Design a protein around this ligand. Structure first.
Ligand SMILES: O=CN(O)C[C@@H](CC1CCCC1)C(=O)N1NCCC[C@H]1C(=O)Nc1ccccn1
Ligand code: NI
Length: 196
């Protein structure tokens, strides 16, 4: 299985572990994890974060053939579990990362009326092509999740962090970024939509 393969001590996640469009796992609703977590579920989250860090190191990324990424969801590894990792760099920054988290069973429990979209659109490590347009999301979200120790966290996100976490939560619900582009005018700006 993918989880057995990926959670070996020696394994480094790379693009050959990341499934692409067409694989039905990307369109399936992922299963909640139960607590306590298995060792494999803990290691998996750690391996996903290690992938993100490798992908943001230009030297390592070049050596491993990685596309640089800011989030990853377990279904993208063919693992239908509600586990995500997010690593959003800060834009000379005092700290490297705006947000660094491995989240188990993440859930949006509140959201703003205002919407938001990245001005440059979105891409996805599972999508080997460009789809232009504003990916319409909630501007701000309150997210509950559990950490690898089983502790519950409630966080509030805005800006880029909010977008990234919603992209990954979509993956665990079988949703892809282009599902949220307006089919009639990909660059429409509706009332209450904040373009970032
Ligand atoms: O499910 C998760 N994914 O599909 C990986 C995606 C997640 C983000 C896309 C937009 C919102 C969340 C991802 O990270 N990207 N999209 C594919 C290739 C580019 C890459 C990216 O934005 N890279 C980046 C940006 C700034 C700094 C460093 N790297
Ligand atoms: Ni994606």
């Amino acid at each position: 299985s993918a989880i057995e393969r990926i959670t070996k001590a020696a394994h480094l996640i790379d693009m050959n572990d990341i499934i692409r469009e067409g694989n039905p796992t990307l369109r399936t609703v992922a299963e909640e994890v139960t607590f306590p977590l298995s060792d494999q579920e803990i290691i998996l989250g750690e391996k996903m974060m290690q992938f993100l860090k490798h992908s943001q190191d230009p030297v390592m990324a070049e050596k491993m053939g990685l596309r640089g990424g800011v989030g990853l969801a377990a279904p993208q590894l063919d693992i239908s579990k509600r586990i995500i990792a997010v690593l959003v760099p800060n834009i000379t920054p005092q700290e490297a990362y705006d947000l660094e988290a491995i989240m188990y069973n993440p859930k949006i429990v509140s959201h703003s009326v205002q919407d938001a979209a990245l001005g440059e659109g979105e891409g996805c490590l599972s999508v080997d092509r460009n789809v232009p347009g504003y990916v319409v999301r909630h501007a701000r979200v309150t997210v509950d999740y559990f950490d690898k120790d089983g502790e519950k966290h409630r966080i509030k996100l805005k800006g880029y962090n909010s977008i990234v976490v919603q992209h990954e939560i979509d993956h665990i619900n079988g949703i892809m970024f282009y599902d949220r582009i307006n089919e009639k005018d990909p660059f429409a700006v509706k009332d209450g939509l904040l373009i970032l």
